[PDB]
Amino acid sequence: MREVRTIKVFTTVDNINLHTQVVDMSMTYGQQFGPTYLDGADVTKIKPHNSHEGKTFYVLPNDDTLRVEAFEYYHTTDPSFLGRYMSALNHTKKWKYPQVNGLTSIKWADNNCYLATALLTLQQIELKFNPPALQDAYYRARAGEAANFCALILAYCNKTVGELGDVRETMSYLFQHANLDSCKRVLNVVCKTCGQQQTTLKGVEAVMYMGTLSYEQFKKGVQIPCTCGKQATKYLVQQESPFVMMSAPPAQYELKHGTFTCASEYTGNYQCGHYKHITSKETLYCIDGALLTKSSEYKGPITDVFYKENSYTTTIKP
Ligand SMILES: [Zn+2]
């Protein structure tokens, strides 16, 4: 038998389409919308105040219209997506993002070194994301608002804050949401008696290789067993992509200046390690979270190396 007091607020799932709602000041936001967020903070267990008049609240996609709007923006209708994204955003907005040598890094916290390495890599390769939420956060990440982008990365990769991570695993997850269908790779394997056989790779597989860190060795030739037994030679004949990513288990490797875009250093064992990002500019730079180190040459345990590419064709011919 208690009076009703009302204020008008806005609900959204993408912060682009706002939906006017009139709420009762006697019930909580959870009792009317479900899980509700106001500027990242969970406001489910509280009641509307006059200070909420006209503000915009995040909600989970329960309505038919909200599912469509969430699908066009995030490319997913998973109900636990926003939940995991808001939980991650609660940590990433508390992180420090120093501007290390014109790039945006992350101060070490909650084992975020693999995210920092990946975020630095994403700022040095040409890449377009299909989900609008990622592409919007990608540009603001290059500007400086990387807290929102790191939360999306964690949410898309299904990785909770504080857990150890893999840079290559993180990159390949994001590559699925990238427009890489125009990338093309032509490989050629030659055997001494079986003969020669060429295959073509498109999409994500055209920009990743697991076997050697050296882009040059991939062009000169890598030894690969044949179905007949003896050792064959595989070479990269044609490559069309904005970049290539060469990966291998962490081994001591020398990075010569000007021969790559950036690389991933991994120190430690398979159970627990430490990620550092090496980048090549006027000289060799080493970004370790908030720390920076120069040197003319570099020698350390590398696991991923990124190269710039546009169009490469050998003239040898098959
Ligand atoms: Zn053979």
Side-chain angles (χ1 to χ4, degrees):
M1 52 176 205
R2 285 213 48 252
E3 299 171 346
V4 288
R5 293 179 301 169
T6 56
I7 64 169
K8 147 190 193 138
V9 300
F10 296 98
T11 58
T12 190
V13 301
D14 52 328
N15 202 17
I16 299 166
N17 290 25
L18 305 192
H19 306 286
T20 302
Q21 306 289 344
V22 181
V23 304
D24 183 22
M25 303 229 282
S26 63
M27 305 167 59
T28 74
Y29 283 104
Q31 299 176 20
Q32 306 183 68
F33 297 150
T36 307
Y37 302 91
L38 173 58
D39 297 318
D42 195 338
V43 297
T44 299
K45 300 176 181 179
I46 77 172
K47 301 185 182 186
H49 189 254
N50 280 312
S51 62
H52 298 163
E53 177 87 307
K55 291 196 183 304
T56 299
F57 296 80
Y58 269 83
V59 296
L60 267 58
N62 62 4
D63 294 335
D64 292 318
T65 60
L66 292 181
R67 279 180 204 105
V68 175
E69 291 175 356
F71 170 73
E72 295 186 10
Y73 195 58
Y74 300 101
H75 282 197
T76 180
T77 59
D78 193 338
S80 73
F81 182 81
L82 276 77
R84 295 182 289 99
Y85 164 62
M86 296 274 85
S87 297
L89 187 57
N90 199 273
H91 287 77
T92 63
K93 70 183 186 271
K94 296 176 185 173
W95 286 348
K96 293 293 173 294
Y97 303 94
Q99 292 291 133
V100 181
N101 201 10
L103 301 171
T104 302
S105 186
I106 311 175
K107 182 190 175 186
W108 83 294
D110 306 323
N111 296 315
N112 61 12
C113 64
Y114 76 97
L115 268 178
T117 298
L119 176 66
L120 292 168
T121 302
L122 290 165
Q123 300 174 76
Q124 294 177 304
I125 58 179
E126 188 183 316
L127 202 65
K128 302 298 186 299
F129 288 114
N130 291 327
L134 264 183
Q135 194 67 8
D136 295 4
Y138 191 16
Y139 288 160
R140 300 194 162 187
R142 291 179 177 274
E145 175 183 356
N148 214 267
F149 185 60
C150 298
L152 286 177
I153 294 179
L154 290 162
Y156 278 110
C157 304
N158 198 20
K159 294 269 300 177
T160 47
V161 185
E163 290 296 322
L164 305 171
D166 184 280
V167 169
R168 184 186 68 88
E169 184 175 351
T170 298
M171 297 301 292
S172 66
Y173 266 106
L174 292 179
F175 289 160
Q176 295 186 344
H177 294 281
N179 192 333
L180 299 186
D181 45 44
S182 54
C183 294
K184 182 181 177 183
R185 167 173 289 172
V186 181
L187 298 183
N188 188 83
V189 187
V190 62
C191 180
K192 298 171 184 178
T193 52
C194 293
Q196 187 181 318
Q197 170 71 35
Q198 74 172 1
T199 67
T200 302
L201 297 173
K202 289 173 189 175
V204 182
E205 284 178 299
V207 305
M208 300 183 61
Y209 183 82
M210 181 67 203
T212 176
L213 298 181
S214 176
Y215 196 20
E216 283 285 67
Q217 190 73 55
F218 194 34
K219 305 173 179 177
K220 280 64 184 171
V222 181
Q223 298 305 305
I224 276 304
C226 180
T227 64
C228 70
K230 54 182 173 182
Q231 202 81 24
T233 299
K234 173 207 285 278
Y235 328 74
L236 176 64
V237 169
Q238 184 170 2
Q239 178 74 26
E240 291 186 340
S241 65
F243 64 87
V244 293
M245 178 184 179
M246 309 294 296
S247 298
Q252 211 76 8
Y253 186 73
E254 178 180 8
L255 290 169
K256 304 209 278 174
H257 165 255
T259 65
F260 70 104
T261 299
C262 59
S264 300
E265 177 190 15
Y266 185 77
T267 53
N269 55 353
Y270 62 101
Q271 199 156 6
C272 183
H274 187 58
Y275 266 112
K276 293 183 184 173
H277 182 78
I278 283 86
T279 175
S280 170
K281 305 188 161 201
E282 73 276 18
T283 186
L284 289 186
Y285 285 84
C286 179
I287 308 178
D288 183 22
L291 314 187
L292 187 58
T293 298
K294 310 181 303 179
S295 56
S296 303
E297 39 180 2
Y298 181 83
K299 181 179 179 59
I302 305 299
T303 178
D304 305 301
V305 189
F306 291 81
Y307 301 84
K308 262 193 59 59
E309 188 58 272
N310 179 265
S311 187
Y312 157 83
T313 52
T314 188
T315 62
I316 293 312
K317 203 162 139 54

